[PDB]
């Protein structure tokens, strides 16, 4: 008789806002978590009085977060916080390597640990991690990629250990999605997006809404038998390489 409660991290970012809007549309109470207080408050204002409550937290302390959530009973975690730092190993430092691991892998561990006890107590929980195709194939951003590969491992570890408690854990792996994370690259090469279309079999990129739709599905009773899964939402990117296939077959693929 009360709304399902969903905690969504990185809520003020491009995919995060789409996640919040989609789960709100599905009838959830959404706890929108972001480290950026001003950006989060503005998004909450824009939502117009929805069933949303902001949480300002940087995902470095699970016990602090759990205490902040003491009046809530979180049924679903969408673990979406985490951005890439260095784009190549050449550009990577030990510090930026460690920082990408903390922000993209350990932040998710912290998010899970803040809500997992209640899920297990109620024998009901869905953990839906937003990963990346970079966690599966070498495409750049190497510390980020290693962290996102670790998230796939972590989802599977969660799945086998807590499935007996009715908790499911899955990873959605987006390809290129148009978010503010691309602003610097678009300013450097304004044709980056059109040059990228050739790699994608669907000749277009997933949108933030497309990612949110997959997260909603995996978080729902329509996926109650799905756990430990990696679902790419990537316009077909991980299936292969249609640009190389065209060169290999001398037939038109794109």
Q: Note whether 145 and 139 are within 8 A (CB).
A: yes
Is residue 157 close enough to count as binding Na ion by CB under 5 A?
Answer: yes
Q: Which residue has the tokens 């789409």?
A: 18
**Span interacting with Na ion, options 121-129, 149-157, 174-182, 243-251, rule CB under 5 A:** 149-157
Nearest to 65 by CA among 108, 123, 2, 100: 108
Q: State CA 55 to chain mean position distance.
A: 17
Binding residues among 220-249 for a copy of itself as defined by CB under 8 A: 222-229, 231-236, 238-242, 245
Q: Which residue has the tokens 């990612």?
A: 211
Nearest to 148 by CA among 125, 171, 116: 171
Write down the H helix ranges in 56-181: 62-68, 94-101, 107-113, 116-121, 142-162
Cβ closest to a copy of itself, residue 41 vs residue 229: 229
Nearest approach in angstroms of CB 149 to a copy of itself is 15
Contact with a copy of itself (CB under 8 A): which of 203, 219, 248, 250? Answer: 203
Laid out side by side, the sheet with 125-130 consists of 52-56, 29-34, 5-9, 76-79, 125-130, 167-174, 230-233
Tell me which of Na ion, a copy of itself, none is bound by residue 154, counting a contact when its beta carbon lies within the kind-specific cut-off of 5 to 8 angstroms.
Answer: Na ion
Nearest approach in angstroms of CB 48 to a copy of itself is 24
Tell me which of a copy of itself, Na ion, none is bound by residue 69, counting a contact when its beta carbon lies within the kind-specific cut-off of 5 to 8 angstroms.
Answer: none
Query: Is 144 considered catalytic here?
Result: yes
Catalytic residue among 109, 144, 178, 200: 144
Nearest approach in angstroms of CB 9 to a copy of itself is 22
Is residue 156 close enough to count as binding a copy of itself by CB under 8 A?
Answer: yes
Give the catalytic positions in this structure: 144, 148
């Amino acid at each position: 008789t009360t709304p399902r409660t969903t905690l969504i991290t990185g809520a003020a970012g491009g995919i995060g806002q789409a996640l919040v809007r989609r789960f709100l549309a599905a009838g959830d109470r959404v706890l929108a978590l972001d480290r950026d207080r001003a950006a989060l408050a503005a998004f909450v204002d824009a939502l117009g009085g929805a069933a949303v409550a902001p949480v300002v937290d940087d995902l470095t302390d699970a016990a602090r977060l759990a205490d902040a959530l003491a009046n809530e009973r979180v049924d679903v975690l969408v673990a979406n916080a985490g951005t890439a730092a260095s784009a190549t190993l050449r550009a990577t430092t030990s510090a930026s390597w460690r920082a990408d691991l903390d922000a993209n892998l350990t932040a998710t561990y912290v998010s899970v640990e803040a809500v997992l006890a209640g899920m297990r107590a109620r024998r009901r929980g869905a953990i839906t991690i937003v990963g990346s195709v970079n966690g599966v194939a070498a495409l750049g951003h190497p510390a980020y990629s290693a962290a996102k590969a670790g998230l796939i491992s972590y989802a599977k570890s969660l799945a086998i250990e807590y499935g007996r408690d009715g908790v499911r854990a899955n990873v959605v792996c987006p390809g290129t999605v148009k978010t503010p994370a691309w602003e610097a690259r678009v300013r450097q090469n304004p044709q980056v997006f059109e040059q990228l279309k050739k790699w994608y079999p669907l000749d277009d990129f997933a949108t933030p809404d497309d990612v949110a739709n997959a997260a909603l599905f995996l978080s729902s009773d329509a996926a109650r038998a799905i756990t430990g899964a990696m679902l790419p939402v990537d316009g077909g990117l991980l299936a292969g390489n249609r640009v190389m296939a065209q060169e290999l077959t001398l037939e038109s693929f794109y």
